[PDB]
């Protein structure tokens, strides 16, 4: 995902998320909306599955 | 270190003893918990006395 780093500002962990990591070809079965949203330097999450 | 988004405690910071300097530049130490900083930096190395 990247070559290096050298210095940060911020993190963040949250609660654990648990995902299937296998790809298959049928149909679907969920829907996924993200909004991502910058005002005074506020970064913001709106999702809801 | 970087320390941020987190609430400060510097309450056990002064209520040790074990410690030898307290000297506080620029700030007063005696109001911390009434103060809100943006970004909160900890260096760390050992001198001799
Ligand atoms: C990180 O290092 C760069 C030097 O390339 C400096 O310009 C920047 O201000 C540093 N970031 C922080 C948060 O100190």
């Given at each position: 995902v990247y070559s290096s780093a050298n210095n940060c500002t911020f993190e963040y962990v949250s609660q654990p998320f648990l995902m299937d990591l296998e790809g298959k070809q049928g149909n679907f079965k969920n829907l996924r909306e993200f909004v991502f949203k910058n005002i005074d330097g506020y970064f913001k999450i709106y999702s809801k599955h | 270190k970087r320390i941020s988004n987190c609430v400060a405690d510097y309450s056990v910071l002064y209520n040790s003893?074990?410690?030898?300097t307290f000297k506080c530049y620029?700030?007063?130490?005696?109001?911390?918990?009434d103060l809100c900083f943006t970004n909160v930096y900890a260096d760390s190395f050992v001198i001799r006395g």
């Open positions: - | 003893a074990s410690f030898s620029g700030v007063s130490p005696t109001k911390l918990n």
